[PDB]
């Protein structure tokens, strides 16, 4: 009979309770105080312009129909009490497919303080939509948003607020850093009003500033493109009479260049414009194509067909003696100006 006291209290709080009406329907505006604990910022899929985030989406409001007098003050109740009372219908404005986890019980709690204050935290994984501007790829920085607000209640009925200060109302856990490519720098929040055909709603926008780490693309796209240009520019160190040898340099370097041109944008979306990685590849294509037409220039001016044995042999060319210095120099000038104008932005 010790638990019959808490049985009488909980049944009295639901006797005459109508869960289709927000509290203070005819009196005031229901302030729902919210804060987010990010357990793990999941992987960012740049191919689908989305990102995954696991949150502890806490909410708190005040209901005057749930006052009680009893032994304890805060009732750490079960989960199924939350479906029997009014809960705010917060939805994410830019969510795509978000899942409330159900194992083993539903991952929600509900605490009812004795003055009528409520706390209602949910564990949710949000596949929100992050609009990107992949123009400075891969050295870009993004501010992926997460906008949430009420759906059926306008700004004269339900207004949102942060529980703690807005600087410390979205907290990222230290161990949850499931970004493998990007690098989370910090979070910023905001509040505003959106306009719709039905009315005016209170939106709650938070931004997660992300910066991409270019350590993958150096050893996948940049270094094999740089080593291809060096592979094309060793062709000026051969002799003029080795046509079959130098045309292997002139063909296989640009043929492995155009495969890297294909295989660089494979992960990238159908980007309408050209990224900064495509500008490096296009200049590197010009450096391996000019090496071939330099060989086409010197082969046209090669008079004899035999080679030095020590007869009058072919004398080395001024084109090869000038391309041995200028071609590593102008690629050095371009490499100095491309990285300086992009890494210090």
């Amino acid at each position: 009979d010790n638990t019959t006291v808490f049985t009488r209290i909980l049944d009295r709080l639901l006797d005459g309770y109508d869960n289709r009406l927000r509290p203070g329907l005819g009196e005031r505006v229901t302030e729902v105080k919210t804060d987010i604990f990010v357990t793990s910022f999941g992987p960012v899929s740049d191919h689908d312009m989305e990102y995954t985030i696991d949150v502890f989406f806490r909410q708190s409001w005040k209901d005057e129909r749930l006052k009680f007098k009893g032994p304890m003050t805060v009732l750490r109740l079960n989960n199924l009490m939350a479906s029997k009372i009014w809960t705010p219908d917060t939805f994410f404005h830019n969510g795509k497919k978000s899942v409330a986890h159900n194992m083993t019980m539903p991952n929600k709690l509900l605490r009812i303080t004795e003055d009528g204050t409520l706390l209602y935290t949910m564990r949710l994984t949000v596949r929100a939509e992050c609009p990107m501007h992949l123009e400075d790829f891969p050295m870009d920085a993004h501010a992926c948003p997460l906008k949430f607000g009420s759906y059926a209640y306008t700004r004269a009925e339900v207004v949102y607020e942060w529980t703690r200060e807005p600087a410390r109302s979205v907290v990222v856990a230290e161990d949850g850093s499931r970004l493998n490519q990007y690098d989370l720098l910090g979070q910023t929040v905001d509040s505003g009003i959106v306009q719709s055909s039905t009315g005016e709603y209170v939106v709650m926008t938070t931004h997660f500033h992300l910066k991409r780490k270019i350590g993958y693309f150096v050893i996948q796209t940049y270094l094999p493109c740089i080593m291809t240009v060096i592979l094309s520019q060793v062709s000026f160190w051969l002799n003029r009479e080795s046509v079959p040898a130098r045309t292997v340099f002139g063909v296989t370097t640009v043929l492995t260049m155009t495969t890297l041109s294909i295989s660089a944008r494979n992960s990238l979306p159908k980007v309408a414009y050209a990224t900064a990685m495509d500008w490096f590849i296009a200049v590197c294509y010009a450096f391996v194509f000019s090496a071939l037409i330099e060989f086409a220039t010197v082969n046209y001016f090669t008079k004899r067909g035999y080679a030095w044995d020590g007869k009058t042999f072919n004398s080395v060319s001024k084109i090869d003696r000038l391309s041995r210095i200028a071609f590593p120099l102008l690629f050095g000038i371009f490499n100095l100006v491309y990285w300086a104008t992009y890494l210090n932005r």
Epitope: D115, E161, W162, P166, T188, D190, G192
Partner: antibody, heavy 117, light 106 residues
Framework: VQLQQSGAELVKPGASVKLSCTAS????????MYWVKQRPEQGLEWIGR????????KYDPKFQGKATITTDTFSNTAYLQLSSLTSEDTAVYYC???????????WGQGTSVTVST | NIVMTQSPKSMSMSVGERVTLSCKAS??????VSWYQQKPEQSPKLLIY???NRYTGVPDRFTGSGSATDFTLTIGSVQAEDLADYHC????????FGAGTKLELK
Amino acid sequence: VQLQQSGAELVKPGASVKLSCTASGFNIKDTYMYWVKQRPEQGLEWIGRIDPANGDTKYDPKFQGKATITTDTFSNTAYLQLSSLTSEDTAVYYCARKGLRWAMDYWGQGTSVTVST
Amino acid sequence: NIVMTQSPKSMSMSVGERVTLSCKASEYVGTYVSWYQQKPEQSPKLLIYGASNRYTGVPDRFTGSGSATDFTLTIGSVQAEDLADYHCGQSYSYPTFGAGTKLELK
């Protein structure tokens, strides 16, 4: 609605002072309590805040170890405590509460402290 | 820590024209910027809570503009009951205030 503070006081340097801010028309347990320093011919200076639901307190880094707040729910009044006050701290103290967008909408009438002979 | 700079310190204009206050934050504050006036030997009150969101009871001539860093307070027509200095606060972090901006009438 109405925010009330006690009257002005005359204190010696090195002593301790007690100042109160009585709230009426609304309870303290749902809104923060903001207290702020207003020097003469100068701007405002926030010194600390109070969460009365759990007794949480955070101070200004300059005024750490300088002020202390206790809050009684039954009395509907929160209390100052200035332990090591000097003669330089001659100003007026204002009471405030958290508003709609973390503003300070309702303010007290202000109590001016005077540390002189 | 956040610091708010109000410019200028003081100004002198007459009744019924335009004034543009200025308030610039050290780092990003989103919208939580509060404007308070201080009538001499009275209590402060609230003009705009948030950025560009008028309080109840103040006239419609007071308006604000908000951004990431800079915030302006604009009065369309200065009246004879506006004898106060305006303080620009912030609330995105632990709250801080500017030095205020005095004004006078001829």
